[model samples]
Target: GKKKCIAKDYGRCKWGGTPCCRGRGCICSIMGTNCECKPRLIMEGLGLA
Candidate 1:
């Protein structure tokens, strides 16, 4: 499968910008600054969580 990302920003795509981050490069909002987990990385992290 292919990984996804945001078009307007240099970041990863999660749940259509759901379960997202919060600054300048955040997942959902442009004003957000946190980095979002990649699809594979997220899957791994979720397993750990």
Candidate 2:
């Protein structure tokens, strides 16, 4: 049970930066970002897409 994210979100990770949710980080590629959902809190906090 974990969530997905995109390193491309901020162009920072690009390969190993996205954080997976199951109590750890995944640093996986994006393409999965839109497939799932994200909270506005993070978007606003990071001031990103």
Candidate 3:
């Protein structure tokens, strides 16, 4: 029910993508130099995780 991302900080997000938050167990996506994070369950079902 929430949002999160790997690019831990603003700097990393600008570069591309990063790993999961571990604690949040989420997935990341990079588009047009922006990174987005989604719940593992959602991404896993979509085969993106």
Candidate 4:
């Protein structure tokens, strides 16, 4: 329903994207391996957790 790492671990989304619950600043923590999904922090992005 919602969206990780290594590209293999965080494979392509089936529907293309996600809602992520609501008011979340999807943080992608990856560069070499692959990007992952998570609630962005107050120092980086949203703090609406």
How accurate locally, in lDDT, is each candidate? 0.40, 0.36, 0.40, 0.37
| Candidate with the larger lDDT of 1 and 2 | 1
Residue-wise lDDT of candidate 3 within 1-49, one digit each (tens)?
A: 1256443532232223354444333333454433443333455466755
If the candidates were sorted by their TM-score against the true structure, best first, what order would they fall in? 4, 3, 1, 2
Off by over 4 Å in 2: 1-3, 19-49
What does the lDDT read for residue 11 in candidate 3?
A: 28
Q: What lDDT tens digits, residue by residue, belong to model 1 across residues 1-49? A: 1134234333453554433332232343476544454423433345764
Deviation from native of the Cα of residue 10 in model 2, angstroms: 3.7
Q: In model 4, what are the clashing residue pairs, if there are any?
A: none
Which scores greater on lDDT, model 3 or model 4? 3
Candidates in order, TM-scores: namely 0.19, 0.16, 0.22, 0.25
Provide backbone clash counts, one per model. 5, 0, 0, 0
Give the per-residue lDDT of model 4 (tens digit) for 1-49: 2333123223322223533343333444455333334443345545544
Tens digit of per-residue lDDT, candidate 2, span 1-49: 2226643333233223444332232233366543322322334456665
| RMSD to true structure for each model, in Å | 8.5, 10.6, 8.2, 8.2
State the lDDT at 21 in candidate 1: 34
- Candidate 4: residue 45 lDDT (0-100): 42
lDDT of 1 at 40: 39
